[PDB]
Structure 1
C-alpha cells in the first residue's frame, strides 16, 4: 500500500532537475526508441534499445548493466506512481508517452523482463488516471424509454458504446496487443513453461483485469477473452 509521505518526498527529490543525470532518458525519433544516459564520469552515450538487447544477448557486459539499470529505474517509476500521486504521473506521462511505451512493449526483440517492466508502468501510469472509474456490471435502475423492443448482444453493447465519451479510445491498441499475446500463449502447448515469460504473462493479465474493471471491453469481446483465459488455465 502506497505511503503518501515518503512517496511525495521521493517524487520531489528524484524528479528534481538537479538529479536528472541519474535518470536515463528515452526518446522516440524518426520511428525508433533511443536511450540516452551518462556514465559515472562526464560522458554521454546515445544508443538504441534494439542494439542494446542484441549485444546483451551476445554477452557484452556494458549493455547488460545499462539494460538492468533501465529496467530497475522503470520499476522505481511504476512504484512511485502507485495510488494516484499525481505530482509524479504528470512528469512521467510527459516524459513517457502511451505510443512510446506501446512500441517498447509490443516489439518482441527486447527481453521479457523489460517488457514486463513497461507493462507495469503502463498499468500504473496511464491506465490508472482519473478519466475513468469502476463500472458496476448490473444496474438496478432502468428507464422505460431505454428498454428496446428487441435486444440482442450487439444492441446491448451499442448503448454502452454510446455511453462511452471517448470517440477514439487511447488504449484500444493495448487491448489488441493483449488479445494477440493471450492468443499466442494459449496456442502454445505449455502455457506456463518459461520462467521469464511468466512475469510478462502476469503483467499483461493484470493490465487486462484492470482494463476490464474500468468498462473498456464489450460483452462480445469479454466472452472471447473469457474463452481464451479458460484455455490458458487448462
Structure 2
C-alpha cells in the first residue's frame, strides 16, 4: 500500500485500520509518562506518515501537548530537519505551525528547542522556504521575494498581493498565509528574549518597516496583527527595556518638592522617556489613533479580523506602559479611551 494511494476506494479499509491504530496510540499515552516516552521512540515514523489522513497530526499534538520534559528529550536536530524537509516538499503553512508549536510549550518558551529551530531555519541553507522582505524606493514600498517549489523566483509588492487576494487570487492568498505563518514562527522563536534569533530577524524586518506594514490600512487585519506581534516580540522586549515599579517606597528628603503637580510629576522622569521613545514615538501615536478609532465606532468587537489586531495593539500598549513609556497625563488620557472601549452598549 502507498501513502499517496491510501485515498483510493481500494485502500479505504487500510485508512480506517491506520486511523484506529493511531487512536489506540493516542489513548494509550494520556497522562502516563511511561507510555508517552515509549511511544516517543517512534517519532520518526509518525513524522514520515504526517500529512496524510491518518490522524498522525492529532496523535503528535496530543503527545507533545503540555509535556516540557518529553518535548526537550525527544525533539532534536533530526526532528527539526525532518520538519524542514517536509515543509520544503509541501510548502504548506501547517508545518510552520507545527514548528511554532514546538517552539513554545504551555505558553512558555523552551530555550533548547527554540535554539535548535533557530539554527536549523536561519541557517544559510533552507533559505528557499522563507519569504524575503525588502524596501524599494518605487515613499518606500514593501516587496516580497520567494522561491517556488520549482526553484523559480517570484517578486511582488505586498499591496498588489493583498489586492489580488481580495479579488480572489488563490496563489496570492496562499502566499499571504504562508508569510503570516512564517512571521508567527519568527515571533515564537524570538519569544522570551531569544537574542540569537532577534539579532538576525531585526536586520531583516526593521522597526520602520513593521510600523509601515501596521499603518497600511489596505493590508489584511490578520497580517497587520502578525506584524504587531512581531514588533512586540522582536523590538519592544529587549535588553534596554525593563519592567518598572509604579510605586516607590524609598524617597530622598531633599528631593521632595514643596509643591507637586501632575506636570512636575511627569517631568521628574521625562528624560529617560524622552530619549527612549524616539524609536517608538510613531508606534505609540499609531496605538493611540487605533484605540480612538475603535472607541469611536459602535460595537467595538464585531469583526474577528479587526479583533485580532485590536488584541495585538492592546498587548503592545500593555508592554509599553509596563516598560514605562507613558507619563501620568498620557495614562489618564488613555484610561478614558480604554473604559469607553470596554463600556456597555
Counterpart Cα distance in 2 of 1:163 and 1:151: 20
Aligned partner of residue 21 in structure 1, secondary structure? helix
Q: Deviations over 1:38-89 (max 9, x none)?
A: 1111211111000110010000111101111000100110011111111000
Query: Residue 164 of structure 1: SS of its match in structure 2?
Result: helix
Structure 1 runs, 4 residues or longer, greater than 4 Å off: none
Q: Deviations over 1:114-144 (max 9, x none)?
A: 0000011100100000102110001111122
> What is the CA–CA distance in structure 2 between the aligned matches of 1:190 and 1:232, rounded to whole Å?
9
Corresponding residue SS for 1:35: strand
CA separation of 1:204/1:132 partners in 2, compared to 1, >3 Å: closer, same or farther? same
Residue 147 of structure 1: how far off its partner (Å): 1.6
CA shift at 1:37, angstroms?
A: 0.6
Number of aligned residue pairs: give it: 234
Q: Displacement of 1:164 after TM fit?
A: 4.0
Equivalent residue of 2:154, what SS? strand
Which stretch shifts more, 142-151 or 169-178? 142-151
Q: Structure 1 residues 9, 167: closer, same or farther in 2, change over 3 A?
A: closer
Q: Tell me, what secondary structure is at the counterpart of 2:146?
A: strand
Could you tell me how far apart the structure 1 residues matched to 2:313 and 2:233 are?
A: 12
C-alpha displacement at 1:148, in angstroms?
1.9
Aligned-pair distance for 1:167? 5.8
CA distance in 2, matches of 1:58, 1:16: 36
Q: Distance in 1 between matches of 2:111 and 2:120?
A: 14
CA deviation digits over 1:7-65, x for unaligned, max 9? 11001000000111111000111111111111111211111000110010000111101
Going from structure 1 to structure 2, the CA distance change for 1:167 and 1:9 (only over 3 Å counts) comes to closer
Take 1:119 and 1:214, find their aligned partners in 2: how far apart are those partners?
A: 17
Pairwise CA distance, 1:149: 2.5
Which blocks of at least 5 consecutive residues in structure 2 are unaligned? 1-107
**More off after superposition, 141-150 vs 216-225:** 141-150
- TM-score (norm: length of structure 1): 0.97
Alignment deviations for residues 142-193 of structure 1 (CA, whole Å, 9 cap, x no partner): 1223222221111111011124472652111111000000000000011111
Higher relative contact order (CA 8 A, sep 6+): 1
Q: Distance in 2 between matches of 1:42 and 1:167?
A: 44
- What is the CA–CA distance in structure 2 between the aligned matches of 1:233 and 1:168, rounded to whole Å? 27
The Cα RMSD (Å) is 1.1
Cα separation, partners in 2 of 1:179 and 1:168, compared to 1, 3 Å: closer
